Structures are given as C-alpha cells and as structure tokens.
Amino acid sequence: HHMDLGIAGKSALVCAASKGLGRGCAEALAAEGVNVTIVARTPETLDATAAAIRANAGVDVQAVACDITTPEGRAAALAACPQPDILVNNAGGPPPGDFRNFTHDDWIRALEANMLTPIELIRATIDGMISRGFGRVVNITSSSVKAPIDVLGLSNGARSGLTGFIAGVARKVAPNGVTINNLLPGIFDTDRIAVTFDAAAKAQNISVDEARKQRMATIPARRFGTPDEFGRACAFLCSVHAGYITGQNWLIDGGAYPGTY
Amino acid sequence: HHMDLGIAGKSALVCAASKGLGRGCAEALAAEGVNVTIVARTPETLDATAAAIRANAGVDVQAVACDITTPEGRAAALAACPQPDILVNNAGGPPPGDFRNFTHDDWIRALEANMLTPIELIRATIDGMISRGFGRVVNITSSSVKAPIDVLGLSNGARSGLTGFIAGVARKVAPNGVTINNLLPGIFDTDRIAVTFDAAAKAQNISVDEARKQRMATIPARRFGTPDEFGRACAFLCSVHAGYITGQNWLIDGGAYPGTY
Amino acid sequence: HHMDLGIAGKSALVCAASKGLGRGCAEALAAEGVNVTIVARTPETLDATAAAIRANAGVDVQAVACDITTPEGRAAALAACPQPDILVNNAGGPPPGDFRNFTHDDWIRALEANMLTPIELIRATIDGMISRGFGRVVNITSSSVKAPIDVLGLSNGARSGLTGFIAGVARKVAPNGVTINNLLPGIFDTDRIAVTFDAAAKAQNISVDEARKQRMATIPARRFGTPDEFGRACAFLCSVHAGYITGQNWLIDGGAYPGTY
Amino acid sequence: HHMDLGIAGKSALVCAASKGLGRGCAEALAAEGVNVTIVARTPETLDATAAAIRANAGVDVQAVACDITTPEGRAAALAACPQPDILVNNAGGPPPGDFRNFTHDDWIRALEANMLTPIELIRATIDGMISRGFGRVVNITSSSVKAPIDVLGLSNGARSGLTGFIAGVARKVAPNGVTINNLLPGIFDTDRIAVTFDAAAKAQNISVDEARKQRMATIPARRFGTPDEFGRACAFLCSVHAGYITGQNWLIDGGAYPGTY
C-alpha cells in the first residue's frame, strides 16, 4: 500500500540540499519520481548526495555547486533547472547572538539568505508555473516565526519577514494552480544542531548525549525530528493532493510550540 | 511512484462517514490498508458506502448505524471498534442564524455535536492508544475557528471550544506516540453546501451553477475543495510520517482565509 | 496630567466583582465616573466593596447578590441594570483536573459558567447598546485561549468557545458604535492565586513568599499582575478613545506566553 | 473624570511625527506631561507641529529635522534626546506594487526604513531604559503583519520581519521594567491614504470621496481611524498602567481584519 502523489516526471529545484532537511526533501521528491536539481556550496558532499539519489531513485538528478544566496548562484541554479514545477527554498541559517551584538551587516546577510533569496527564486520561477497551470513552492523556515528563539534574533526577524510576504504572494498566484506554503521545523537531528549541542555540552560539563537527552525531555513528542519525515511532509505539499492548501505555515515540531494556533 | 504511509492493517473509527468529508477520510485510509469502521445514522447510505469501500480497497469494513452525538451511539461505535489506532472525529454541523435568535437548546446541541462528542470519543480511546505507543486522532472542524463565519455563530463557538481543549490534550499525550490534530475545511463540494446553493439560486432567481461560480470567484484557488483531497490530508496525518506533527490546525481552504497565520 | 475617557455618567454592569479582577474593573470604571452595578454571590463582601467604591469614587453603586452563571441570577442582575452602556463579563473559573476525570456534566457546568453565561448577557444587552449608538463589552477570559494550561482543560475549552463566538458578534455589531473585546489575564495577584500558592508552600514546606517568587522567576516581567492595572486596561477599552478597537484579544501577562502573536 | 498615566516629566523620542499617526502619538504623550522630541525630514511642518504641541501641552518640545532611516539621522535624534524613557518607532512606509516589479533595492530600502531602523533605535536606547528600571517602546507597524495587503508586499515583508524580532527582544528585556509592543493601524485618516484614494478614484471613474465612502462601508466600524485615538492607545501603552503588557500586537482597525486572533 502506498499513496500516488501524481508528480512523477515533474521537475524540482531543491535548494541547500546536499545534507539535512533539504536533502530529506530531495530524497522524498525523487522517491515519488520527481527529477531533482539539488544545490549546495561544497562539491564533495553535493556530488555524493546526487549520486546516492540517482542510484536509489532512478530519476534524473542534477547537481549545482553554488551559494544560492547570491544572484550568480540563483542564476546558476536556474540555468540547470530553468522551468521547475516544484521549488523548495532553503539556505543556511544565521548565527546566534544577543541582539545588542547584531551589526547592520549581520542583519543584511540574514535578510539576504533567509528572506530575499527565496523571494527572488519565486520571482524567477513563478511565471513558468502560472503558464503551465501547476506549481508548488515550499519554503523551509523555522519555529522561530511562531515563537522567537532566544539566541536566534536574526532568524526571528528574517524568516518572519519572508513569511509575511509569502502570505500575500500565495493568495495572489492561487488562481493559477500554484500553491506556496512554508514548512517550519522544530528541532531536527541534523549536523546543524550537533554544533549547537557540542558547544552546549562543553559549557555545561555534561556529555552531548546528556544535553540532547535533556532537550528531548522538554519536547512533548520526546524526540527530535528526522530529515526523512520532514521530506515526506514536503512531498505531500508538492503533490496533486495538496492543491487546496496554500498560504499555510505547517509547524512540524513534536508539539514543542505551546500556542493553540 | 507511491508513498507508504505504514498503517496497513491498523484500525480506524471514522465518524459521520457515509458521505462527504468523513467518507473521503474513510476511503483514503482504506486505500492505505486501514480497516475502517464507519458511522452514520442512515443505514441505506451507510451500507452502500461500506460496500463500495470493501469492493475498492479490500480491507475489513464495519458499518455502525447510530447517532454519534449520543452516549448510546458512542457506545455502539466503540463496541464495534473498541481499540482503534486511528480516530476521525466528525458529526453534522449546526444550523445558521443570527446570534440573537440562538436558544439555549441551540447552544447545547452545537456543543454536544461538535465539541463534547469528539472529546468523549478521545477520552474513551486514548488509554488504549497510549498503551500501544501509537495513536492518531484527527478532528474535522472548520475555518470558523480561524475567522468567524457570519451566520454560523454556533460553529464559531462550539468548534473553537473543541480546538482550545485539543491544544492541551495533544501535548499531554504526545510522549506516548499519539498525535492529535485538527483539519479545518474551507468550502468543500459536498451535499451540505448544495443545500446552501439551492436555496440561494432559488431565492435570487439564478441557476445553481451561477450561484456556485459567484462563490468560487471569491476563493483564491477559484474552486471548491474535493472530499478526496481532504481525505488524503487526513491519511497523511494518520501516517507513520506525521509522528512529529501534533496539536496542529491544518487549514485546507484554497487560500480563502486571509490571515498570515 | 490625566486622560479623560469620556464615560462619566454612563452605566456599567460588572459581573463577579466583589473581589479580584472584577473588582479592579469596577473600581477603574467608577474612577472615571461610571455608575457601576456589581454582582457577586456573597452579600457581605459585595456590600463592603460597593460601599468602598461609593466612598472613593462618588458614583452610584448598585450591588446585586446572585449567581451570575444561572438564568435566575442573570434575570436579577438585568432587572437592576437593564440598559448598561458597558458590560464586563466575568464569572468564577472551572476546577482543575485531568481530562480523563472530567464528567460530561463537568463540561456542561464549565460551558454554562464561562461561555454561555457571557453570551446570554450580551444577547440581553446588545439591542439597547445598538439603539443608543454606543456600547462596550469586555469579556474577562484567560491566557488559556492562547496556550492551554495543563490542569485547566475545562478553561482551555469553554473560554476558547466563548472567544470564537465573540469574534463574529464583535464584527456584526461594530456598525452601531458597539465594541466587544476580550481581556486575557496571565497570572494576577488575587485570592484565587493566593490560595494556590498557600497550597504550594505547604506542599514544599517553604514560605508563601518563596513559592510566589519561584513562579515569578519564570515570567519575563518577573512579577504577577495587579487587579488595578487589569481594571485600567478594561477602562481604556470602555472609553471613547477605543472605539476603533473591536474583536481584539488583549493578553496582559508580562510576556509569559511565548508566541509572536 | 480622568486617568493619571504617571508619566509626566518623562522623556519620549517620537519618530516621523510632524504629521499623521506619529503626530498623534506625540500630542497624546505631551498631553500627559511627557517631554517629546519629534523627528521629521521637512522643517516647515516639523517646526509648526512643534510650536503647536508647545502651545497645547506646556511641555518641553524638541524638533529634529532628519531622515530617521539613516545612521546619521538616528544619531541626530539621539543627540537631542539621548536617554528617552519612551521610544515611538515610525517612518514612512514602502511604495505599492506588484511583487514581480520589486527590485532588490526596493526590498533593502523597505527593510531599512520599517525593520532595521526601529531595531537600531531600540539597540541605542535600551541600555538606559534597563539602567533606570523603566522603559516603553511602541513600534507603529501595520495590519499588513496580520493579513497581507495586496499591493503592499514590501510592507507585508518588512514589517513582519520587525514583528518577529520584537517578539524576542520584548521578552528578553521584560525583567528590567521595559515593555516593547507594536501598534498595528488599519486604515487611518491621514495624508498617506489621500494619495491612495486619489489614484484609486482616478482609475475607477469615481471621485476620491466615493472611493473613500465605498471603502468605509466594508469596515465593520464603518469609519476610518483618527490619529488622535491612535495616539491615545500609544499613551496608554506608555503609561505606568501597562507595565504587564509586553510583546503584544495591538490591532486598531475597526474590526476589518477577520481573524479570531
């Protein structure tokens, strides 16, 4: 038994996807027959992930080595995948800090990476989607837009800016068979959080395993998220069964956010 | 290809499901190998839907003819399906009117059908789900909990009451592999909205098609929702790939609700 | 200086107001020249509060000793104050417990007290406000409608039901110079709370002062709310300066709720 | 009667305040005895409004002619008012347009004016507020953060970015007697909307008065907001009676936004 998402043979541009949540989305789309173009900066891991997906899924896989948060990187991605049916927006997130230490340049860099980059990729791909009467955009954001994360003010700001803009464009382009939705991760078991736990353990004189355990104990689901399950939610949003879902912020966080809505 | 939801052979109790959104949920779950018990008041339609799901899905189908908004009906449903892995809560919705004409009996009827009935079925099934380390509850509610519907004050109130309570229990039971989420329909093309469009077309002296087209033009997606796609979202929430999603209100409305969140 | 709220000589019906937040609202309204009818069950305390407001504010004060959560109590309150310009809805809160121990009648009782009671008082007073082109309704609810409180499922449900219904009525009656808003307290230093901390101190063999300080340490403002400041926010909503505020949920909680919105 | 806000003799920096909502905030604070420093680019209207507030309120009024969205302008404002107790953040909003015509520079300018400028003024004033154990920051934003405005994508984005960041800093600084809240205008009767209706009428073959009338008819309160009542709400947030309100988004829109929350 398995659910046909109806997107085999379509094309997807999956940003920041040699590892982690982006990789999970690329894998899940390829599993459903989507030809995927994956983007990341470092060739070694990018080429390896592209080869793995090729050998596991049997779809066409393209790899673009670029910084997606530059105009030149966006142009390189679109040169490889010029008319995507499906766009998964993603890029590395901003550094932590106390708000009094954020510089103007820190703000601009976070806004470029996690707000203006997704917006520009939508701008560059939306006309083709509209012309074909089908389109799916999924933006990987953060629980930070629902409840601010203490040390991640740059995310609290930049990703909330993206989300507020997305609300408008989602409803504007909805008449044309295009949906635009955001996937908001709680804590997911990737290399990104291992850096955070490594520093937290060393500061607290406990093991990383113990620090991870203590964090899990505060999550209602009592675990971290997996890149696999994140990618499956992405694939569902990109399917022919989610065409009546647009402008939505899907929080995938094990219940950690306490708000009713 | 096709995505394996991992719930073949599980049991679901699907309330108010001979027609409409409930039937869509039952069929989508049966398509993934779930043995479904479906509940409705009218035996003829209920038996015909049960027979159709048997013929199409090949799963075990039980049909319980009862009023799910009564304790005798809830007991009869649970007697047939006493340890469901999956509970889909649903019942008929309240009648329209101006708030100054709502009677006390009106309020109790709406609160019983669309708040206390789902709560009682959760109370009666949660301990078995917890003991097995797996459970899925999906409550069919309404866009009325995000933005009040003019003439449906009884829904605006009763379903918001359910949602506020669900927020707490979803997080309370999450440590045990149980998730509880709400699916909020916008306008879906069922028999319930045909009653509204027939009375509109006849009153205004226009065709039903014209009356429906006027409403569609106000929806960003420019169509109504289908019971099939509603059921597919339900099936995803009930899957092994949605275990990190709980306490969430999933609005499926073609972008009609204008709020950013 | 001092801000003239423009409501001197108007009439207010203030429910559940011999003590606590309700008394704070009655005193703040009376300080602005509003003639207040205050309602509580216990005559001794009610009369003492009524006499203190008379002495300090110099307005007309009526005391009605009744149970506002019954139809007979509402009839008595409205007989004494049949055409209020201002209605402050309030009642005792529901008891704590685990949802598996809520009886069906526990739910009915909480729904009657904290949802249907304020709805019926609005229905009985809204026509007069509309006919005069001025009206203010303020409903005392709870932070429980923004984030569920663990042991207060009955509040999480009933007050959320009220709130969803209020959303519709507020926008329905806004053309007639009537506003309807909700005031959502976080933890406020009333007798209800003082009893709770007496139990915590005794259970832990610590002083009441230490038990209270333990809770304050988790609140961003690092204190509890005062009934006075709650009443002042109520009075501002009831003023001629808040006529463009309706359907709003004002959370007054020292930042304790972590959600962005 | 009249309510004492307890802020006579305190100092406020009120940005973008020779006209409109900013002027309304400055006048309301001055009316409660606050010494106000008002900032605007054009000297003619700035000096006239400063003279009016001096004559009306008898407080100290400083006028700074500068563009508050530049570092040099922020520095000039702070030179005049180096240790404000109260900061009202405000600046001119972004131009309208279709999202496909927004340039990278359009985005940066909107982000600078309506997100990074308020953030930098908070960073420059928060230390002193904390050191005195009292502070009030009110950010004038927009209903666009609750529901996107069709042609104002630059606002939908930039002001949502501010709001997501403010959520974190409000809770961070709350232990020190500082509150940070946002005031979200719906449509207010200022010079800003005259330009909007001047274009809306010129294209619709109706008068600006007719276009205004038709827009009013869609607002539940059936009118536009006044700068006076907006300023009064600002003054209440800045008072000693609002110290338990922080991190809140106060929507002042006559009920036009349809969302329950």
Ligand SMILES: NC(=O)c1ccc[n+]([C@@H]2O[C@H](COP(=O)([O-])OP(=O)(O)OC[C@H]3O[C@@H](n4cnc5c(N)ncnc54)[C@H](OP(=O)(O)O)[C@@H]3O)[C@@H](O)[C@H]2O)c1
């Ligand atoms: N993990 C969580 O708990 C969590 C939760 C919420 C939000 N997030 C956010 O979700 C996003 C993905 O996080 P993750 O945990 O999946 O991180 P991850 O495991 O480190 O994966 C990041 C991936 O993106 C690529 N990448 C990063 N910046 C890029 C850029 N500018 N251009 C192109 N490729 C880029 C990386 O490869 P290269 O380094 O070779 O480019 C890698 O393939 C981040 O924005 C993160 O802040 C994460």
Ligand SMILES: NC(=O)c1ccc[n+]([C@@H]2O[C@H](COP(=O)([O-])OP(=O)(O)OC[C@H]3O[C@@H](n4cnc5c(N)ncnc54)[C@H](OP(=O)(O)O)[C@@H]3O)[C@@H](O)[C@H]2O)c1
């Ligand atoms: N359609 C929409 O646009 C929409 C949107 C939001 C919310 N909703 C809500 O979603 C729910 C389902 O609506 P729908 O459009 O699917 O309606 P529908 O097409 O009329 O189907 C309702 C189903 O529920 C059954 N049912 C009704 N009352 C029952 C009861 N007391 N006990 C057992 N079964 C009962 C009906 O069969 P019997 O009559 O034989 O019992 C039928 O099988 C309602 O609460 C509705 O208000 C609908």
Ligand SMILES: NC(=O)c1ccc[n+]([C@@H]2O[C@H](COP(=O)([O-])OP(=O)(O)OC[C@H]3O[C@@H](n4cnc5c(N)ncnc54)[C@H](OP(=O)(O)O)[C@@H]3O)[C@@H](O)[C@H]2O)c1
């Ligand atoms: N304090 C908080 O932290 C907090 C926070 C959120 C919500 N709330 C809610 O706010 C409401 C007021 O709480 P509070 O802290 O102000 O309580 P409080 O200090 O105990 O005052 C309650 C007042 O209401 C009266 N009352 C209670 N039940 C009544 C009834 N059936 N009919 C008429 N009068 C009635 C009481 O007098 P009699 O006993 O003589 O009738 C008393 O005057 C409650 O619903 C509470 O749950 C409180």
Ligand SMILES: NC(=O)c1ccc[n+]([C@@H]2O[C@H](COP(=O)([O-])OP(=O)(O)OC[C@H]3O[C@@H](n4cnc5c(N)ncnc54)[C@H](OP(=O)(O)O)[C@@H]3O)[C@@H](O)[C@H]2O)c1
């Ligand atoms: N009116 C509404 O319906 C409405 C609703 C929601 C949001 N808003 C937003 O609220 C803000 C205020 O709007 P409003 O209606 O009050 O406008 P307004 O009547 O045109 O007043 C704007 C004031 O700000 C000053 N100003 C503008 N940009 C400035 C800058 N960079 N530096 C310093 N002073 C500056 C202007 O004077 P100078 O030109 O001489 O500098 C003037 O004193 C805007 O961001 C607007 O988009 C307005």
